C-alpha cells in the first residue's frame, strides 16, 4: 500500500484537491488509500470514492469504444490488413479497465459492503458493485459474460430490494440505482421492456412523492428524474 | 526501455491510435519508444511526438496552476491553517511535470537535435527545447529560475536565427516558433515590449508573403497569424 504512511484525513483532503485539479487517477488512489485504513466511510467520503473511479473508468470505457470500433472496421469486407496492432492496443486498454474494475470490486468486498449496515451506505455500495460488474460485462465475451452479467444483476437486485423497503421513492440514491439498473437492462441484458418499465415506474412513483420535499431536495430528485425521462425518450 | 521489444512502425501506428482514443500518456510513451530506436523522425512523426507531450504536460500545467492558486490563498491574511497537504500535493504534481519536461529534453539531447540537419527538423526540435525549458521555468523559483530561463532563451534564439535564414516568413513552423518565443518574452522574461514587437513584426512580414501561397498553405499560415493577433489584442 503506497498510501499506508499517510493519515486518513490527509488522504481525504488530497482527494478533494485532486478533484479540483481534475486529477482523477490521483483522486482514486487517495480514496483507495483512505478505504484501506479500515474505517467506514461517511456520505461525503463515499461520494468522493464514486466520483474518482467513475471518472477513471469513464475515460477507459471511452477509449476502449474508440479502439473497438476501429478494430471492427479493420475486420470487415474490403479492409486491407494492418496486422495485430489495433487488437493488441485495444487489449491493453481493456486489461487496464478490467484492473480498475477489479480494484473497486475488491474494495467493496474487503470490506466496505459487509460493514455497511445503514440503508444509505449499503444501497450505495451494492449499486457500485452492480456498476463495476456492468463495466466488466461491456468488454466480456462468451460464457464469461454470462456469469459477469448475473453478478451485476444480483448486486443491483439486492440494492433495489433494500431501497424499496428503506428509502422514499424520491431518495436520490434510490433514483440513481433505478436509473443504472434500467441501463443495465437495456444495454447489457437485452431486456429493453424491463428497462422501460423500471424507468417509468420509478419516475411515476417519485413524481407522486415530490410534494413531501423541500426546495433543495426537490431539485436533487427532479435532476435524476430528468435523466430517467431522457432515457425513456431515447428508448420509446 | 519498455518499448524496446516493439517494432518502430508498430509504435508509430499505436501512437496514432492513442491520439484517436485521446490517450496522450500512452501516445507519448509510444513516441518515446519510437525515438529511442535511434532513427531520425519524419515530419509526421515529429508532429506526433509534439502533440503527445504537449497534451501530457498541458494537463500537468493546468493541475499545477489550480493547486498553486489554492496554496497561495492558504498562505494569505485571514486563512485558517490546513497543514502541509496542499503544498505536498502541489509538489507531487510539480515533480511529475518536471520529470516529463526532463524526459523530452533528454530525447532532444540524445540524440534528436544533433542529427537534425534540415531547417524544418532542426527548428522544430530547437523550438521544442525552448518550450520545455519554458515549462520548467514556470514552476522554478530563484537563481535556479535564471539558468532555466536562459536555456529557454538560447534554444528559441538559435531556432529563430535558422528560421529567418532558411524559411519563408509564412512557414508555419517559423510562425509557431515566433508565437511561442513572444509568449516566453511576455510571460517568463518580463519583456512585454519585446513580446509585442516580435509578434507584430512576425505578423506583418507574413502578411506581405501570403500572396505567394496556395489556398491550403494560406489557410495554414493565416491560422497561426490569427493566434499572433489574438495575443497582441490581449497585450496592447
Ligand atoms: O451510454 C452511456 C451510459 O451512461 C449512463 C447513463 C445513465 C446512467 C449511468 C450511465 P454509466 O454508468 O456511465 O454507463 N455512456 C456513459 C459513458 C460511456 C463511456 C465513457 C464515459 C461515459
Ligand atoms: O497561457 C497559456 C499559453 O498557451 C500558449 C499560447 C500560444 C502559444 C503557446 C502556448 P503554450 O505552449 O501552451 O504555453 N496557456 C496554455 C495552457 C496552460 C495550462 C494548461 C494547458 C494549456
Ligand atoms: Mg492515523
Ligand atoms: Mg481481453
Ligand atoms: Mg417490477
Ligand atoms: Mg525492427
Ligand atoms: Mg519542487
Ligand atoms: Mg528583432
UniProtKB/Swiss-Prot annotation, chains A, B:
InterPro entries the record matches: 14-3-3, 14-3-3_CS, 14-3-3_dom_sf, 14-3-3_domain, 14-3-3_sigma
GO MF annotation terms: cadherin binding; identical protein binding; phosphoserine residue binding; protein kinase binding; protein kinase C inhibitor activity; protein sequestering activity
PTM annotation, UniProt: Ubiquitinated. Ubiquitination by RFFL induces proteasomal degradation and indirectly regulates p53/TP53 activation.
Tissue: Present mainly in tissues enriched in stratified squamous keratinizing epithelium.
PROSITE patterns attached to this UniProt entry: 1433_1 (PS00796), 1433_2 (PS00797)
Leader sequence residues: none
Principal location: cytoplasm
GO-annotated biological processes: cAMP/PKA signal transduction; establishment of skin barrier; intrinsic apoptotic signaling pathway in response to DNA damage; keratinization; keratinocyte development; keratinocyte proliferation; negative regulation of innate immune response; negative regulation of keratinocyte proliferation
GO CC annotation terms, alphabetical: cytoplasm; cytosol; extracellular exosome; extracellular space; nucleus
S-S bridge residues: none
Phosphoserine modified-residue sites: 10, 79
Site (Interaction with phosphoserine on interacting protein): 61, 134
Location within or outside the cell: Cytoplasm; Nucleus; Secreted
SMART domains in alphabetical order: 14_3_3
Assigned keywords, A-Z: Cytoplasm, Nucleus, Phosphoprotein, Secreted, Ubl conjugation
Domain of life: Eukaryota
Subunit structure: Homodimer. Interacts with KRT17 and SAMSN1. Found in a complex with XPO7, EIF4A1, ARHGAP1, VPS26A, VPS29 and VPS35. Interacts with GAB2. Interacts with SRPK2. Interacts with COPS6. Interacts with COP1; this interaction leads to proteasomal degradation. Interacts with the 'Thr-369' phosphorylated form of DAPK2. Interacts with PI4KB. Interacts with SLITRK1. Interacts with LRRK2; this interaction is dependent on LRRK2 phosphorylation.
Family statement drawn from the similarity comment of this UniProt entry: Belongs to the 14-3-3 family.
Summary of the function given for this chain in its UniProt record: Adapter protein implicated in the regulation of a large spectrum of both general and specialized signaling pathways. Binds to a large number of partners, usually by recognition of a phosphoserine or phosphothreonine motif. Binding generally results in the modulation of the activity of the binding partner. Promotes cytosolic retention of GBP1 GTPase by binding to phosphorylated GBP1, thereby inhibiting the innate immune response. Also acts as a TP53/p53-regulated inhibitor of G2/M progression.
The name this protein goes by in its record: 14-3-3 protein sigma
Amino acid at each position: 500500500g503506497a498510501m499506508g504512511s499517510m493519515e486518513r484525513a490527509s488522504l481525504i483532503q488530497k482527494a478533494k484537491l485532486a478533484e479540483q485539479a481534475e486529477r482523477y487517477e490521483d483522486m482514486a488512489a487517495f480514496m483507495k488509500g483512505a478505504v484501506e485504513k479500515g474505517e467506514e466511510l461517511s456520505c461525503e467520503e463515499r461520494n468522493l470514492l464514486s466520483v474518482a473511479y467513475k471518472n477513471v473508468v469513464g475515460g477507459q470505457r471511452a477509449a476502449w469504444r474508440v479502439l473497438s470500433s476501429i478494430e471492427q472496421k479493420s475486420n470487415e469486407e474490403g479492409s486491407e490488413e494492418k496486422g495485430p496492432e489495433v487488437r493488441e492496443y485495444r487489449e491493453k486498454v481493456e486489461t487496464e479497465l478490467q484492473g480498475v474494475c477489479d480494484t473497486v470490486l475488491g474494495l467493496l468486498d474487503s470490506h466496505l459492503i459487509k460493514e455497511a449496515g445503514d440503508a444509505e451506505s449499503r444501497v450505495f455500495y451494492l449499486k457500485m458493485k452492480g456498476d463495476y460488474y456492468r463495466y466488466l460485462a461491456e468488454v466480456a465475451t462468451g460464457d464469461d459474460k454470462k456469469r459477469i452479467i448475473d453478478s451485476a444483476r444480483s448486486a443491483y437486485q439486492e440494492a433495489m430490494d433494500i431501497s424499496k423497503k428503506e428509502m422514499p421513492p424520491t431518495n436520490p440514491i434510490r433514483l440513481g440505482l433505478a436509473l443504472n439498473f434500467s441501463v443495465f437492462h437495456y444495454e447489457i441484458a437485452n431486456s429493453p421492456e424491463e428497462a422501460i418499465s423500471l424507468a417509468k415506474t420509478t419516475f411515476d412513483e417519485a413524481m407522486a412523492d415530490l410534494h413531501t420535499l423541500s426546495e433543495d431536495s426537490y431539485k436533487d430528485s427532479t435532476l435524476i428524474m430528468q435523466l430517467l425521462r431522457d432515457n425513456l425518450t431515447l428508448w420509446t
